[PDB]
Amino acid sequence: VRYSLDPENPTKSCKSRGSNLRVHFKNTRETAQAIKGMHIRKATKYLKDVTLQKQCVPFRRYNGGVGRCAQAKQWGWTQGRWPKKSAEFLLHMLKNAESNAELKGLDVDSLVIEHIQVNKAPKMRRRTYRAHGRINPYMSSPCHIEMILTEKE
Amino acid sequence: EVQVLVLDGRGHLLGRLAAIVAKQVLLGRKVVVVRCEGINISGNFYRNKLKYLAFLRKRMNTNPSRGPYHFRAPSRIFWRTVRGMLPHKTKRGQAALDRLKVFDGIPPPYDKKKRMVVPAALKVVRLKPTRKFAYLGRLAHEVGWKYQAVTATLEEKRKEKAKIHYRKKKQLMRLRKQAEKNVEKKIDKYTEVLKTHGLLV
Amino acid sequence: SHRKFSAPRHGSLGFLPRKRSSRHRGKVKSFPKDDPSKPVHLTAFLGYKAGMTHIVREVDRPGSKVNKKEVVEAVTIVETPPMVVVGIVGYVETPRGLRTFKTVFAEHISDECKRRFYKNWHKSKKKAFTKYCKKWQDEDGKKQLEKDFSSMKKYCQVIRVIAHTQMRLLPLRQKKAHLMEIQVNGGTVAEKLDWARERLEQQVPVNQVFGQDEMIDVIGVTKGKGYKGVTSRWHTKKLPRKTHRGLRKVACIGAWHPARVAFSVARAGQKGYHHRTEINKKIYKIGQGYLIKDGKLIKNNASTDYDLSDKSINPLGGFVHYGEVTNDFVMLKGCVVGTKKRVLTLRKSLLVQTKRRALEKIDLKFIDTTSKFGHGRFQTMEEKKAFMGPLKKDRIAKEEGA
RNA sequence: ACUAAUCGAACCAUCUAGUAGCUGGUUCCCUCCGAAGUUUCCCUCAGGAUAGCUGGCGCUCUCGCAGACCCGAGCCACGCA
RNA sequence: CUACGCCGCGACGAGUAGGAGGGCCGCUGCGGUGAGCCUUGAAGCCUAGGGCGCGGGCCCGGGUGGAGCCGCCGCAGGUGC
RNA sequence: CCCACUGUCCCUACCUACUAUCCAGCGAAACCACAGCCAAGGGAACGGGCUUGGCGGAAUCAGCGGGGAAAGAAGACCCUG
RNA sequence: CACCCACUAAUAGGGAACGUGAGCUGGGUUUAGACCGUCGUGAGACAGGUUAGUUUUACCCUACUGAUGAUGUGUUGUUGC
RNA sequence: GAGAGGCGGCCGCCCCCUCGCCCGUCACGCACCGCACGUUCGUGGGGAACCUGGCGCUAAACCAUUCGUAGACGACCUGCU
Ligand SMILES: [Mg+2]
Ligand SMILES: [Mg+2]
Ligand SMILES: [Mg+2]
Ligand SMILES: [Mg+2]
Ligand SMILES: [Mg+2]
Ligand SMILES: [Mg+2]
Ligand SMILES: [Mg+2]
Ligand SMILES: [Mg+2]
Ligand SMILES: [Mg+2]
Ligand SMILES: [Mg+2]
Ligand SMILES: [Mg+2]
Ligand SMILES: [Mg+2]
Ligand SMILES: [Mg+2]
């Protein structure tokens, strides 16, 4: 498969991927941007804290109607949320990437998420029923997620 | 010129001085105008007060906090007058506006510097002696300015210190003219050179 | 076209930023005009709204119906423990306003005052003013402090004192003290600096600032009411019952032109918690606070010369939502902005009091101390026990304990 | 009123690509020339025919062409405005 | 001196509706022609690559792609948004 | 019209359930030349853009009904055919 | 509009798309039902009377109301102008 | 010297040169062979990083928890050996 942003050296690097994952693209894009550049141990703790609503992700681009929170002040922002499904999907991808790191023989305590990217998957069509005998789409917005972790300490 | 042009605002007509200043800052020159309360405006005081009170009336009916900003300090009145002569909505006019600084009274950075004068904007030469005029300090004070009194006392203190400095300058020049008599025989060799070339009549 | 019938507008436009106050304490915003002929005195104080009660007094207003008659009047008790002076600020008059020339604090700043400088006193290492207090003892620093006082003596027009409340003497949860600048009036800058310097670290009671039956001004923040609609915020007319989208609204928010909504139209938003000043609040009493000479002296708080009853300003069962008033207090007349235990600024009146309503001596005949936690009907514990006699709880109390 | 969510004449298919002086649209470049809203007639007045204004294709002629270089050697084109 | 070529001199240059000319402008297919191009890489597509033309457009470099395509002389259109 | 009755009103207040609000999950539609601060001017005689001035400070949340001569329908009134 | 009662210091006159319907109401006007008078042969008509008659959408931009924030003084806090 | 002092002045000790100012004597310096951006403020401002000596310092903010003087959510008032 073709990753965007091939690593500067594919020997201190590990890759993880997921296609057609059933999480909201907008939520996962904000969550991925928060953990970008993080250490893998810091990111795992952070994504667990998002599930417990102890640290939020800052909704920076897709922030229409997103409410305010006190935990957005850790970042330089005002709006934040705690997307549980986006955090769990990225936690599984972090686990898969870490197991790939072990298979490549490089230690997992120096890994940093140097690349992460969320693309839009093909939408899945459902149906809703409206007032005057009308039908409107009820589409889902899945996403492809890819990541690259590199050793640096 | 590359230096900073400091102008004394006393006795200067408002728009006459503002026109000269506006062209100066457009030519890349830094201009400082001090004693903006000494600027005069042609026409009797009641006439000029009516002009500014009409300006106070012009405000945004929907939200006056967005409307015209009426600045009551004489420095800010002169600053806004110069702004009306610049293309202040372009980057060139904004840069020119940044080269101009205005002060009520004379602050300590400029009170020890010799102050220039624009003859083309002076009331003595640009106005007939029988015509009435108003003072920008009085006009501003009677329309909302809050610091006519404190600027008055600080200007008196500055003038007291300047008188002392001037009497030291007089004492120095008196000594220098006396010196030119004391060393007269060993100076006339260089004095005759000066006289034949116009300097030192 | 013109509206059919004339009607005054709802709500004053003099309070138009109808927003939550940026401050909780309430700043003075105007001190009384300084005249050097008067003696050196303070102009402000900090108190805490304890509660309300009512009094009985004899009116001495000639020509009125209530002349030589007894009236009752609501009063507000404001607990005012003595302030502690911890610093001096100098100000110099400039053509741009007053600007702080130099601030000199004192040694031994109290812990309660030092909590004001910390958002999190718990995790703090309490390092505030640790190096500043060291220059009050060395040689070069002490000489520098003298230079600061001399330059304040020759360049400053108005000086103020930083004073803080002793929050430890109050029954409140809060321990962090409230700092405030109080302008020193009545004298030359040298004289008021000499006065303010010898009051450093000293306690200034409310006795020295305010006097009996004078009109003062109370500055504070009103009770917050949250977001509110136009009928509660601006008291506009409620629309009829038949209205479709709702009746607690303003029907027209502007004409077609000027094609915008004006700032003068009543709209829904934050109500309450506004910074307000109220002038001409008379001081009916300055209480003495609890003392101990041989026993606990409590009588003088609410014992008028006509009552002669040993009781304090505290109602039966304590002030509701506040606690027990133990320090000095000021008994203002009428209502005062703010909730209970809200910090209030008391300021000398800017005006000149010449009317007969002012400068009228107040002689209290009775101070009500019934329970405000319901329909109280007894003034003291002793009166309640005497009226009702022994109860079952006391009957078994003497049985179990002999 | 109702006659399958259709009724002052249902629905389905065809005649049918019904007709429209009326509305909307009408697809590459450069060069040259370049208007009319006026006359007369029409159940003509939101349209046509007709003359006028426009472009294109020409045709019939006129002044002559000049001296290889250089060098004119009363009279000066049909006709038009 | 491709006489449908080349050269000289003088004056001129607005343009809707509209008319006309030129197009070595462009698309598709047929007849001839290029002892044309092409798996040592066609068409198509992408390109901060080099240019030509007043313009319609065109040529060339690089990448991708994987089997067909183009110039010139005529012919014919379901030929340009 | 009268009696009684009452929050229809003077003159509004408080309370309760469900919402709205914030969050986890899920997730549309209308509409959209470009867009979106004003005063005056002139202009298809009522500008978001143009002239002249006032000025202009990221990203947003809850409301709101002044504007967008807001959206919804090739005006059903009137006239023409 | 008018008129009258009553109080009052006075009960002045007007504009803002004859201000103000995604603010309301729908009494009037101004569809379809119906009655009367007049006109008309009739279908039907009447700035004649009368009665019953669906009032839709804001979550967009701005305006406004509130609410976080943002730029700069190294970070941060207190007191302040 | 406080108006925005962001500056200026006066002494005492020490070490240096009798030079630097004018008119003259005396020769020398890359004299780079006609040529531009030369000359200064200036050791300029701003950002990281390395080496080098001395003097020094050892903190807060936010989240989480709590408060309810606050509150749609943020924010705010608060407490925590
Ligand atoms: Mg929104
Ligand atoms: Mg439905
Ligand atoms: Mg259905
Ligand atoms: Mg009126
Ligand atoms: Mg008013
Ligand atoms: Mg209704
Ligand atoms: Mg009670
Ligand atoms: Mg057809
Ligand atoms: Mg006929
Ligand atoms: Mg037409
Ligand atoms: Mg042309
Ligand atoms: Mg076709
Ligand atoms: Mg406008």
Ligand SMILES: [Mg+2]
């Ligand atoms: Mg139509």
Ligand SMILES: [Mg+2]
């Ligand atoms: Mg129609």
Ligand SMILES: [Mg+2]
């Ligand atoms: Mg109207």
Ligand SMILES: [Mg+2]
């Ligand atoms: Mg409207």
Ligand SMILES: [Mg+2]
């Ligand atoms: Mg409506």
Ligand SMILES: [Mg+2]
């Ligand atoms: Mg009706």
Ligand SMILES: [Mg+2]
């Ligand atoms: Mg009807």
Ligand SMILES: [Mg+2]
């Ligand atoms: Mg009949």
Ligand SMILES: [Mg+2]
């Ligand atoms: Mg009748």
Ligand SMILES: [Mg+2]
């Ligand atoms: Mg009915």
Ligand SMILES: [Mg+2]
């Ligand atoms: Mg919402």
